[PDB]
Amino acid sequence: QVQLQESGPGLVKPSETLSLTCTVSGGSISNYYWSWIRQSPGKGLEWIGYISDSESTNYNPSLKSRVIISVDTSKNQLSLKLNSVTAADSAIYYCARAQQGKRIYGMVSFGEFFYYYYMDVWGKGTTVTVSSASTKGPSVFPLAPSGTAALGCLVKDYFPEPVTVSWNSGALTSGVHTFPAVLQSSGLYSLSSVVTVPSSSLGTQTYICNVNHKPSNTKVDKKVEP
Amino acid sequence: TLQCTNVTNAITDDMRGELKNCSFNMTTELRDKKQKVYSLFYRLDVVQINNKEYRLINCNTSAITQACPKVSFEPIPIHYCAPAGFAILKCKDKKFNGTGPCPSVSTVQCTHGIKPVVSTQLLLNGSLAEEEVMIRSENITNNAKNILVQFNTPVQINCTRPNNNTRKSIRIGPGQAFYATGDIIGDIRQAHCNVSKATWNETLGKVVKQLRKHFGNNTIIRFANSSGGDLEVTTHSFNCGGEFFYCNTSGLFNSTWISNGSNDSITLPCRIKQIINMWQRIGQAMYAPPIQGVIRCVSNITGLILTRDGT
Amino acid sequence: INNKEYRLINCNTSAITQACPKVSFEPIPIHYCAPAGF
Amino acid sequence: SYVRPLSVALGETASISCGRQALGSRAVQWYQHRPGQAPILLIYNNQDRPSGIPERFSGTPDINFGTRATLTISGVEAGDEADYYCHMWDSRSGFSWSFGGATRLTVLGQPKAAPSVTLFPPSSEELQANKATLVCLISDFYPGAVTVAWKADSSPVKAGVETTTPSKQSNNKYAASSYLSLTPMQWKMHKSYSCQVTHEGSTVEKTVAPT
Ligand SMILES: *[C@@H]1O[C@H](CO)[C@@H](O[C@@H]2O[C@H](CO)[C@@H](O[C@@H]3O[C@H](CO[C@H]4O[C@H](CO[C@H]5O[C@H](CO)[C@@H](O)[C@H](O)[C@@H]5O[C@H]5O[C@H](CO)[C@@H](O)[C@H](O)[C@@H]5O)[C@@H](O)[C@H](O[C@H]5O[C@H](CO)[C@@H](O)[C@H](O)[C@@H]5O)[C@@H]4O)[C@@H](O)[C@H](O[C@H]4O[C@H](CO)[C@@H](O)[C@H](O)[C@@H]4O[C@H]4O[C@H](CO)[C@@H](O)[C@H](O)[C@@H]4O[C@H]4O[C@H](CO)[C@@H](O)[C@H](O)[C@@H]4O)[C@@H]3O)[C@H](O)[C@H]2NC(C)=O)[C@H](O)[C@H]1NC(C)=O
Ligand SMILES: COc1cnc(-c2csc(CN(C)CCCN(C)C)n2)c2[nH]cc(C(=O)C(=O)N3CCC([C@@H](C#N)c4ccccc4)CC3)c12
Ligand SMILES: *[C@@H]1O[C@H](CO)[C@@H](O[C@@H]2O[C@H](CO)[C@@H](O[C@@H]3O[C@H](CO)[C@@H](O)[C@H](O)[C@@H]3O)[C@H](O)[C@H]2NC(C)=O)[C@H](O)[C@H]1NC(C)=O
Ligand SMILES: *[C@@H]1O[C@H](CO)[C@@H](O[C@@H]2O[C@H](CO)[C@@H](O[C@@H]3O[C@H](CO)[C@@H](O)[C@H](O)[C@@H]3O)[C@H](O)[C@H]2NC(C)=O)[C@H](O)[C@H]1NC(C)=O
Ligand SMILES: *[C@@H]1O[C@H](CO)[C@@H](O[C@@H]2O[C@H](CO)[C@@H](O)[C@H](O)[C@H]2NC(C)=O)[C@H](O)[C@H]1NC(C)=O
Ligand SMILES: *[C@@H]1O[C@H](CO)[C@@H](O[C@@H]2O[C@H](CO)[C@@H](O)[C@H](O)[C@H]2NC(C)=O)[C@H](O)[C@H]1NC(C)=O
Ligand SMILES: *[C@@H]1O[C@H](CO)[C@@H](O[C@@H]2O[C@H](CO)[C@@H](O)[C@H](O)[C@H]2NC(C)=O)[C@H](O)[C@H]1NC(C)=O
Ligand SMILES: *[C@@H]1O[C@H](CO)[C@@H](O[C@@H]2O[C@H](CO)[C@@H](O)[C@H](O)[C@H]2NC(C)=O)[C@H](O)[C@H]1NC(C)=O
Ligand SMILES: *[C@@H]1O[C@H](CO)[C@@H](O[C@@H]2O[C@H](CO)[C@@H](O)[C@H](O)[C@H]2NC(C)=O)[C@H](O)[C@H]1NC(C)=O
Ligand SMILES: *[C@@H]1O[C@H](CO)[C@@H](O)[C@H](O)[C@H]1NC(C)=O
Ligand SMILES: *[C@@H]1O[C@H](CO)[C@@H](O)[C@H](O)[C@H]1NC(C)=O
Ligand SMILES: *[C@@H]1O[C@H](CO)[C@@H](O)[C@H](O)[C@H]1NC(C)=O
Ligand SMILES: *[C@@H]1O[C@H](CO)[C@@H](O)[C@H](O)[C@H]1NC(C)=O
Ligand SMILES: *[C@@H]1O[C@H](CO)[C@@H](O)[C@H](O)[C@H]1NC(C)=O
Ligand SMILES: *[C@@H]1O[C@H](CO)[C@@H](O)[C@H](O)[C@H]1NC(C)=O
Ligand SMILES: *[C@@H]1O[C@H](CO)[C@@H](O)[C@H](O)[C@H]1NC(C)=O
Predict the structure, then answer these.
(1) What distance in angstroms lies between residue B298's CA and the mean position of ligand 8's atoms?
(2) Number of structural domains in chain A
(3) Stretch 8-67 of chain B: residues touching chain A, C-beta under 8 Å
(4) Which domain holds residue A121?
(5) What is the dihedral of CA B176, B179, B180, B181, to 10 degrees?
(6) Closest residue of A to D96, CA-based?
(7) Are A119 and A96 in contact (CB under 8 A)?
(8) CB contact under 8 A, C14 and B175
(9) Residue A221 and residue A146 in one domain
(10) Would you call D25 and A101 a contact, using CB atoms and an 8 Å cutoff?
């Protein structure tokens, strides 16, 4: 009933205000708690902060000096702002709904309790890279094939991660295998997607390769044929 | 000189400081070698210097002596007896005032069991009246003579210190061992007492009825909390399992009664002291050693010690 | 202590009190008696 | 934060002890996290687990003090490989900002799977752009560790090769890629190019040639 979707720039220059947004679907936004969580390479899950239903904010003291969390009740969009970013700030920024738990051990009158929060429904994550390097759209090249056979769609030299790939605009979904990218020494990622289709389907089921690199708004398409 | 910090912050505002984690240099078995040990002291037992430096409350007035932890502060009933050739006369009048001619008299060699309980405001574990709820004062019309009421029904009270304490022996010298408060296993909670709001309201009304006989069926009497003084007299101070409780009683004497709950109880926020001073002479005080485990005593409230102010 | 440092054997357990050297540890025969009527 | 490893045989029961023990009454949250994916709140209150989570995931309630917080995974499967976090709240300590350590559960005894190598020659549009790249795609192998070897005809080739570290697939197997870059003249001036993929103790070769 409730799903979350993050959205970010993907690339932010060093010493600049990062900005991400998170849309709630199905439920309201001003009646729950929401938490920003990021996960850097090598470093574990780090809690950035959270906002209440009454739109009260509380930040992690690790990044308290430079994080501003907001909320827009006109729809279900809550925003995040992080200034003075460095290379160590590149991570997958997740968005989740925090549920307030009141753990009571003694008497509620004397205040012998405490509040704990837990994220029950998360987003999918927005990849954010901090680098002085500029963005670049990929270059798609077809991989013609030759029980069954396999064709591919090479996606080389783009920056930064990621790149979404679908076959036949989402129609072809079985036997698809999209491989992780490769960070070449030149500093650009290179991807490769491949589907395994029956041999008789070569003539002439059209196979359209969809490639989307949002950090450059450079969507492309390409067909494959022997 | 004690170096004190709060023990385990984030509880409920002015509550981290109610008990402190104090560390201090201490003598050892060798007089030339010191030791840096720590101990948990309650806030009522320490005072600042004016930094986080503290000292024991008694040091500028009284010497201190910790009770031999093998002795028991539990009251045992005592029977006072008269020597041979003497006699004890008991007034068996069920509605006796305390003075005047008692019609029914009997003689005994020894009095009944009398527990030497030393409490305040509330008379604990005492003997009950058989009829009504008597009221005794030498000059009741005098406002400076304490009224000693005595119930016929015991209104039960449940006191507890829920903190699971630890006693850490510290040798301060050859043979001498000071028993410090190590740490607290589990939650750091608040000591308190429960008393059934229904029974306390019922028993507080009986005192009102018997108070009408000395001030008129038409007058209005009111219960207010203590008007000041030392800590032992402004609170329901007593002893429960070794530790000396000091219970705020504003929730028991906050009622006005006209000329003419039922489920929950009223709780009493109690503080705890360890360096309790002497009640007679000055320059003397006792250190109650820390009691291990959870303390919870169940006792009767059989009387009160009230005071009028001169409607 | 663990060097040539030592301490008295009793210091970690018991206080110590030297006998007034004018008193004599020499045993003197004692006669226990019963009160009158015993 | 640091990562402490843990190994459990396939089908057994796992015992993941929490990183930091509680000083008082606690409220422990368990999150299942596989890198590059959204964490999954397994258990929020000391033993309460949300819907959509099997009963084989269980925690320890806070009954009497002293009991340590441990996440129990009975009937462990290959999908239970992830990072598990102990979000420890208690009366004593302050606000639990840190998720704590990370127990890297690795399920042992999984079936060994052989790769599915597939080599693609340089595309025509790439050769038209005066560049040429061989791609050697590997999939469906376990344990996730292989070694790629490129050969121009018979002689080895190591200048110009890039390789992905293995990555877990949705079917709990692994996949990696290998990109050999060469000028279009080197692609034509050689007879054939091979990609030898060595997994466990066996090598597999897929070759391609400009014909
Ligand atoms: C003198 O007078 C004093 C003053 O009266 C008096 O002080 C009293 O002291 C006692 C103990 O010293 C105190 O008792 C404690 O009470 C705590 C609170 O319990 C109440 O609340 C819980 C939780 O309520 C939420 O959940 C329920 C459903 O589960 C909802 O219906 C609620 O609405 C609420 O949920 C909403 O609200 C939340 C915030 O408000 C939101 O966040 C949430 O999302 C929701 O919106 C209830 O479950 C309790 O119900 C139980 O009690 C009723 C009677 O009230 C009974 O019918 C029945 O037994 C119910 O089970 C209750 O209403 C308790 O949490 C606490 O017990 C836990 O803690 C202690 C130590 O902290 C543990 O040792 C103990 O084992 C318990 O641990 C269990 O529970 C915790 C909490 O979840 C778990 O984390 C833990 O793992 C463990 O779980 C295990 O047991 C569970 C059941 O016990 C089980 O479900 C699990 O599956 C697992 O097996 C303790 O009992 C009391 O509060 C004081 N009084 C006052 C007024 O404060 C003193 O005693 C007097 N006498 C003297 C001094 O001598
Ligand atoms: C604690 O009280 C004491 C503390 N320390 C010493 C002491 C130290 S050393 C020494 C020997 N010294 C060398 C010879 C004489 C001194 N000379 C040097 C002149 N005696 C005491 N001795 C008699 C005491 C009492 O009876 C008394 O006042 N209580 C005891 C009972 C309570 C009590 C109960 N339940 C209670 C306390 C607080 C709140 C509520 C109830 C009330 C007060 C007494
Ligand atoms: C009161 O304050 C004292 C400090 O003056 C506390 O003692 C110290 O407590 C810390 C934290 O537990 C101890 O550090 C721990 O050491 C163990 C053993 O190596 C280690 O495994 C832990 O990770 C941690 O580093 C420290 O040793 C200890 N020092 C002494 C002299 O006791 C004391 O705990 C406080 N008490 C209360 C009730 O707050
Ligand atoms: C009023 O009188 C009652 C009854 O005599 C007193 O209750 C007694 O309280 C003491 C300590 O609070 C209890 O001793 C404890 O026993 C438990 C259980 O064995 C043990 O774990 C403790 O270490 C300690 O020895 C005693 O059993 C208890 N007696 C009864 C019959 O319940 C009460 O303390 C008195 N209150 C006052 C203010 O005098
Ligand atoms: C010993 O020190 C205590 C602590 O200051 C003194 O108690 C204070 O006395 C003043 C009056 O001069 C009160 O205003 C304070 O409230 C007291 N402090 C408390 C109760 O914590 C005490 O008077 C000193 N004794 C002597 C003999 O100087
Ligand atoms: C609290 O009051 C009750 C009621 O008087 C006491 O219970 C009585 O105790 C006497 C003395 O041993 C017995 O003769 C009665 O038979 C008891 N009656 C009942 C109904 O129990 C109780 O002992 C008192 N508690 C304390 C701690 O003094
Ligand atoms: C108070 O804390 C002590 C420990 O500091 C607890 O003592 C333990 O009691 C259990 C009983 O099941 C024993 O198995 C342990 O061996 C004891 N440990 C020690 C160090 O003595 C005691 O149970 C606690 N009290 C309460 C009421 O929880
Ligand atoms: C004080 O505590 C005592 C015992 O802990 C309570 O007495 C118990 O009352 C229940 C009522 O449901 C009985 O079932 C038990 O048998 C009683 N125990 C004993 C030892 O008599 C009493 O109710 C408490 N009173 C308050 C005001 O808290
Ligand atoms: C005080 O110190 C003495 C000296 O070490 C202790 O006596 C030793 O006790 C151990 C057992 O723990 C024996 O193995 C040694 O043989 C004893 N030393 C002797 C007899 O010279 C004594 O136990 C200490 N007392 C305390 C209370 O710690
Ligand atoms: C103890 O806590 C109180 C309340 O937060 C604070 O005012 C006080 O300064 C603290 N004392 C120490 C020694 O930390
Ligand atoms: C103990 O004495 C030393 C001096 O050697 C001092 O530095 C230290 O602060 C003292 N400790 C305490 C707790 O006062
Ligand atoms: C106490 O009661 C007796 C009973 O006759 C009475 O004479 C006396 O005046 C009373 N004293 C007080 C102070 O009530
Ligand atoms: C009692 O006190 C009142 C005034 O407080 C006084 O008039 C009266 O004489 C006193 N009674 C006795 C017997 O002293
Ligand atoms: C007061 O009222 C009671 C009835 O509750 C009655 O018995 C008594 O005689 C009255 N006394 C006076 C002085 O009015
Ligand atoms: C009596 O009650 C008043 C009402 O708030 C309070 O301010 C005062 O501190 C109380 N006194 C005692 C001794 O509890
Ligand atoms: C006693 O409690 C009342 C309220 O319960 C509070 O206003 C008052 O300050 C307390 N007295 C003391 C001395 O703490």
Answers:
(1) 9
(2) 2
(3) 10-13, 15
(4) 1-132
(5) 170
(6) A116
(7) yes
(8) yes
(9) yes
(10) no
